[model samples]
Target: VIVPEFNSSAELPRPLAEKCPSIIKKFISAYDAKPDFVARSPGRVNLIGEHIDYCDFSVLPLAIDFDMLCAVKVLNEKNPSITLINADPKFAQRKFDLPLDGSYVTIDPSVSDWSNYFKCGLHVAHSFLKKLAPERFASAPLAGLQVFCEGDVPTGSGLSSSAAFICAVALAVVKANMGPGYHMSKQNLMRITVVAEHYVGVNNGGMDQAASVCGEEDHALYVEFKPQLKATPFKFPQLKNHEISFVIANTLVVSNKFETAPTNYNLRVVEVTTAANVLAATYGVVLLNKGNLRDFMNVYYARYHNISTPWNGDIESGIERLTKMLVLVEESLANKKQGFSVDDVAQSLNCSREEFTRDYLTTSPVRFQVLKLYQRAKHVYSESLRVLKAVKLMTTFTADEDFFKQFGALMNESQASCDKLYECSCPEIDKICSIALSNGSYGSRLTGAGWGGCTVHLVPGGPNGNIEKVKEALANEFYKVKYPKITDAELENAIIVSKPALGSCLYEL
Candidate 1:
């Protein structure tokens, strides 16, 4: 977790804060309300660690300086209603009522789409609360809320805007439920936020929610998932006077598929779950539930292979075997003919060949390869370690210059792992990374489920500092040199660099 230096004197930009007064006035007038509390939740940028969370790994993420601030006041009414007002014209005022029992609410993705996001958050929060504190729900009266959100965090730049929004709303509703004079601890707040967001169907690890609640001034929140949520304050080391700083480039290429279905995220969950299950079975335990995977190799590997167990001789040996198995499975999935089947993987792991063949391989392919499986596991293992190291370094460092230098190297390594091992990097991502690097960037890497989203870089800092200028210049140069065929509109859409902002907080109307 790398927390960037903040400009304390920096008031919210006029354009950003302009509508606050009117929104506040409207809320005040709506129900004769006087907001007693204002809460904010910030979007997060994972400085390192992608697609490894479900694997029960670590991630380094910082609560950005920009965030969604919700000015909230509890209503005395028995019915809870939420009103949303946005600056973007396309997303105007919308309202939702908090229903009883908080079951999964059906949402039409076609119209009033944003409502679904809100609904999902609410449903998740309600579900989490019910499970944790059913007594509260039994007698808790519904509360009405008016939320006015403003921020510059783009939705899909891998900035976790959705998480920020969910955290913000969750905080507000939670605070409201606490009623007057009831103070809520940040830790409890974060737990509820995590559960609520997970209930929304993201299977997200707790890092985002932790940052949303525990971010400190000029410090990153180092989070570790799996066993439990643990956060530590992070401070970057000083950089050499001449070192470059961090830069973020948003590849404007909209993820059409991601917009439709977050398949990549789901796949990642499956991968992690599979890995965990394999490890569990090796230890004579059941980490994940049975009948969960559709793939036979997954089941066989989970059942027979002791890949995840404590290796008798060397950890690397276990890792190597695991990698081989993964490659075999992937090969089976890729090839139509002669793909490695479940029985092959079982055989490689020293299982009952005949039974495995009859039970798992009859309908499977035979394309599994040791090399391919090694590549996949190697990526996950390396990425996970990189994330762990980055967290350690970020938390212990102090000066900005040195901090960035090390972080840049880690970023570069992470990107390389993703490209070489994960094999998810795309031409657009490569182009963006190249552009950012050429412009005095220390290092840059494709973030998120990489085939295209954004590239974050480390850039030079100081007065006359022009992160945006560098972004624009690199973008132009990239267009002329590497992708002249791309239109100006496409070029503009392809790259964006935003400053690190604060985590979530509350606002008052």
Candidate 2:
């Protein structure tokens, strides 16, 4: 899994190549020695799916050009320790001694240090290495590691920077302990590192990590977690007259999910889960475990269709089932757009407020005056349907047709659902989406957890394409008006034209 030599930046993508020389230079200067290797994992942009992964539904995302890079060197020391240094001077260096007793690394979530992410990677990767290769663990226990980190993925812009950082750090740990030639599939790494973000206390799904690990260049990934963890790669439509480019425009609102999750991210998760419980109880659908909206859909299908098995259908069938489920949501919710009180939701589930709080709300801290169960459930089912429709569209795409418009319409609808039903989008996000639409974008929506982040727009590309038109309009219309003092370089960084990129891997220097 390791490349023997990376002598030239030409062999790498533009983003990584541009940062390689500086990363290597910083590593050598900091450590006073040549580094052994570098580990890389790219950040992602969700093309169609948004905030639906937690429901155990499929999401379509692509690994973008920007990524996280970690240069590492193994050290021999009496007291094993890990030293982390960031290229950006704002974050100070940190070091921690390794636990020789095979215990996990301790991370204090309250501290909110950058090193906690690296520690999360080391903590999870070490635990998995011990089980996956016990003999190797016995033969070569970890001694020490010196790591120099660098990343171009804009933090808090909904680009999955945390996932890339954690995944890259985990790769460095695996290579440092298991030797350069030790082999571990990207899928396995994705599975183990998927929970790394839990140490940060945010309850996210596997889409970010899966895209970082399993992505393929020039293709978007359809990641599913229902029957099993799987990523199916498919190319965008081969337009006979035009190319395709996904333009990412940052709102610079600083979507610090870790800081504001109680009122935002975590609250949505709690609402989705509770909505599932209420729907199942009111509709007489039985669930054997703690279920989310996806589980509710499967059970609802089985009960209505007179089948004992869960939904194992294809994308088309899933879309059909979900369309029907949307009707049920409207009818059961009485087409209410208002929020449900704690008593209303609790009574629907035939449980007290205390019992509901203990079962769902206790796992994570969520602050909400009232629960938007109808809107939250509607968003999940509708978004799930859109994802399936997107998958089907891309899979059966034909050249030189209205495919771009069709796909873009689905994306546009998703943004509306996210904004209206899910209520994840803010005023800035809504303005950006409308700006992109006013320019030349076929479709545009908030990409990540959408309190504040970047918006991804599907635009027409190639010579005589609308990509440049969209970028120019965003710069002139949005950034200039909002920031007023923004510079050219900052504008370029704010607007990114990214293609599908490769996943995580180890590179030997």
Candidate 3:
């Protein structure tokens, strides 16, 4: 279960190989010691699935070239602690002592703290190590550590930059504590890091962490959270005339999930959770505590087929069953356009508004004028179906099929659903998507936790196709028009031309 390691930068991917020497130099300068290892975690771009992973649905995402790299040196000291410095001085250096009293480090959720991500990683990875290898840890507790972090993944841009940081720090901490010979699976690391970022107060799903931890080169991952947490990597279909590529354009409207979660991101989570619960109760389906919409589909399918376990069937069949369940949801909520009041949703669950609030709304501080249960439910179910369809499309593409057009259509549909139903798209995101589509992209949409972030475009390009055409159009139209005084460097940074990249790894320097 040990992470892949390389002895030299030349053996690493081009992106990591290019960035490693600089980070190592920075680390040496900061700590005055040669680092032991570097933990590299790539940021991810969700290809299709949006705002539905927490609902326990599958998502398609690929790791990008941009990543967070942490250079670390394990130390032997009586009182072990962590000292972290960032290559970017905007994020100030942080020092914290390890609580040997068996307590985890605390993060104040009320503030926008960048170092909190590293702390979150340390807390989760330390606890995991303590439990998984208590005997070993008892003999040799975690050592003092110094880390220098360098992140090229643009923060608050819908790319999973936070996940990259969390995953990298988590990898660095565990590797520092467990020694170089420690064995831990990528999935195990992925699971802990997924939970690590939650400490920052955004209740996100496993998609970002999974893509960062388990990502494969030249393939997109189909990440499933139910039945089991697993990621299956499949090569994207090869187009006959053109090569498939994705261009990411940041709207520059920061959708900081931690800061605005109460009103924007977390509110959607609560609404979706309540929708699942209300639907389950209305249909007389017994859901496990905090069961999501996908959970409801599993049970509903099980009951329909008279089977004991929920149909852990193939993706196609699962999506077919989910489609049927969506019909039931639509029929039940014929008044779909109208927002459901707290009292109305309570009635569906055969509970009082006070009880509903206590059960679902209390977990997160959410502010919403009205709960758009139908809309949120519609967006999740449809987006989930699109993800399944996309997976099928990529795997089953034939020369006879219009692969790009078909897959692009799914992405287009997803954007509309996110905008109208999920209500997560901001004006800039809408403009970018439209501009991308008009330029040359077959499909384009907001990629991360929306309201503001990046839009990924499915461009058909190769020796004979037009990827550069789309990028130039975005520069000439969107960025230049919106920020008339933007610099060339900033403009170049705002857009990323990326392909699928490898996941996290450790480099011994």
RMSD of each predicted structure: 7.5, 2.2, 1.8
- The lowest-lDDT stretch of 10 consecutive residues in candidate 3 is 1-10
Candidate 1 runs further than 4 Å off: 1-36, 78-80, 100-112, 127-136, 139-141, 195-197, 240-244, 256-262, 275-375, 395-406, 463-469, 479-500
For residues 360-459, write the lDDT of model 3, one tens digit per residue.
8887788877788888888898888898889888887555238878989999999999999888898999999888888888899999998898999988
Local accuracy of candidate 2 as per-residue lDDT tens digits, 1-509: 32222435436655556776778899999999978888889999999888889888899999998899999999988878989999988779999887776566788988889999888888788888888777756445575989999988899989999999999988888878877557767778888888888878889898999999877889999998878888888898677888888899999899978988899998998888888888899889877637888788888878878767777648777888899888888988854468888888788888889988888787778898888889898999999999888888887755544887888999999999999988889888888889899899889999999998899998888885898898998888889999999999999899999889888876677
Model 2: lDDT of residue 488: 96
What's each prediction's clash count? 42, 0, 1
**Ranking according to lDDT, highest score first:** 2, 3, 1
Name the regions of candidate 3 deviating beyond 4 angstroms: 138-141, 397-401
Q: Give the TM-score of each candidate.
A: 0.71, 0.95, 0.96
Task: Please tell me which predicted candidate would have the highest TM-score against the true structure.
Answer: 3
